[PDB]
């Protein structure tokens, strides 16, 4: 299972991302030597372990395999010390019944999380935009601590989720974003900004072209910005 001890070691971060990318694309050939997701994997998930170096506490993220979309996470209940599965409010009805098939080690199904999985609701609950949310190792460690084993609030959960999406999912999709995290988010914090946010929104459109050519050429975005680490099915 892909795992990353949230720390300032960029080599481990990059290896973690490659492991994650491969999991999304297992089963069929790569394109331009880039893994590709499977459209039929909408009912399959890829688990990711995030571990704090300080106390070794662990939170397991669950991503829908067809589109690398975060649907929830697993941590430990403070009263029973059991592993509990937590799903976003808009994914709970569809996945709660099969919590054990998604979170392999879950011991109990916890109540639905105080927020939804969409970018719109996540930002509303967190009270901050994708563009100015503070990203980086320290930022993620702090958000993690406000969530693991505690009472969940919409804000704490939403913030933790957004930082994780940027540093794990978006970085997996875009080599350019992985590079930004390596250079600006290992020992410090940084904000994604408007251009990177628009780049992220165009994952599907860029992916489409990669299925037709391995050398795209500059357009709305540069060739480097378009260098994908994971392709969407076509």
**Beta carbons of 162 and 122 less than 8 angstroms apart:** yes
Alpha-carbon torsion (183, 185, 158, 128), positive or negative: negative
- What angle, 0 to 180 degrees and rounded to 10, lies between the N-to-C axes of helices 193-201 and 175-184? 150
Q: How distant, in Å, are the alpha carbons of 93, 149, 168, 208 from that of 226? A: 36, 39, 18, 11
d(C-alpha 16, C-alpha 27), whole Å: 19
Neighbours of 150 (CB within 10 A): 11
Neighbours of 158 (CB within 10 A): 25
Please tell me the total number of residues recorded for the chain in this structure. Answer: 234
CATH of domain 1-172: 3.40.420.10
Return the HEC string of 65-114. Answer: CCCCEEEEEEEECCCCCCEEEEECCCCHHHHHHHHHHHCCCCCEECCCCC
- Write out the two tokens for 186: 């290992």
Q: How distant, in Å, are the alpha carbons of 77, 85, 109, 111, 218 from that of 151? A: 9, 14, 15, 11, 48
Q: Is 173-234 in the same CATH topology as 1-172?
A: no
d(C-alpha 91, C-alpha 231), whole Å: 24
Method: X-ray
Which of 91, 170, 178, 225 is labelled catalytic? 170
d(C-alpha 207, C-alpha 233), whole Å: 8
DSSP 29-79: --BTTB-B--TTGGG-EEEEEEE-TTT--EEEEEEETTTTEEEEEEEE-TT
Of the options 3.10.310.30, 2.60.40.2550, 3.40.50.300, 4.10.470.10, the CATH number for the domain spanning 173-234: 4.10.470.10
Give the DSSP H/E element, type plus range, for residue 4: strand 3-5
Nearest alpha carbon to residue 72 among 38, 95, 44: 95
Residue spans of the domains in the chain: they are 1-172, 173-234
Give the DSSP H/E element, type plus range, for residue 153: none
d(C-alpha 170, C-alpha 196), whole Å: 10
- List alpha helices for 89-214, DSSP H: 92-95, 99-102, 119-126, 137-145, 154-164, 171-173, 175-184, 193-201, 203-210
Residue 131 bears catalytic tag: no
- Write out the two tokens for 224: 């480097």
- Report how far apart the first and last C-alpha atoms of the chain are (Å, whole number): 26
d(C-alpha 36, C-alpha 68), whole Å: 11
**Beta carbons of 141 and 52 less than 8 angstroms apart:** yes
d(C-alpha 109, C-alpha 84), whole Å: 6
């Amino acid at each position: 299972r892909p795992s990353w001890t949230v720390d300032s070691d960029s080599a481990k971060y990059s290896s973690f991302l490659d492991s994650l990318r491969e999991e999304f694309g297992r089963g069929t050939p790569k394109v331009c030597n880039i893994p590709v997701t499977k459209k039929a994997n909408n009912d399959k998930f890829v688990l990711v372990n995030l571990v704090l170096p300080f106390n070794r506490n662990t939170i397991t993220l669950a991503f829908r395999a067809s589109d690398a979309y975060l649907v929830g996470f697993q941590d430990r209940d403070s009263k029973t010390n059991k592993l509990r599965a937590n799903f976003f409010s808009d994914e709970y009805r569809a996945l709660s019944g099969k919590y054990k098939s998604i979170f392999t080690d879950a011991e109990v199904l916890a109540p639905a999380l105080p927020c939804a999985s969409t970018y719109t609701d996540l930002q509303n609950k967190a009270g901050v935009s994708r563009e100015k949310l503070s990203l980086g190792v320290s930022s993620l460690q702090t958000a993690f601590t406000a969530v693991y084993g505690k009472v969940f609030t919409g804000k704490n959960v939403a913030k933790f989720a957004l930082i994780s999406i940027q540093m794990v999912a978006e970085a997996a999709r875009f080599k350019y974003i992985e590079d930004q995290v390596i250079n600006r988010g290992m020992y410090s914090s940084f904000e994604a900004g408007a251009r990177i946010t628009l780049l992220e929104n165009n994952w599907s459109k860029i992916s489409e072209q990669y299925h037709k050519s391995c050398k795209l050429g500059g357009g709305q975005f540069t060739e480097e910005e378009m260098k994908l680490g994971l392709l969407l099915y076509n």
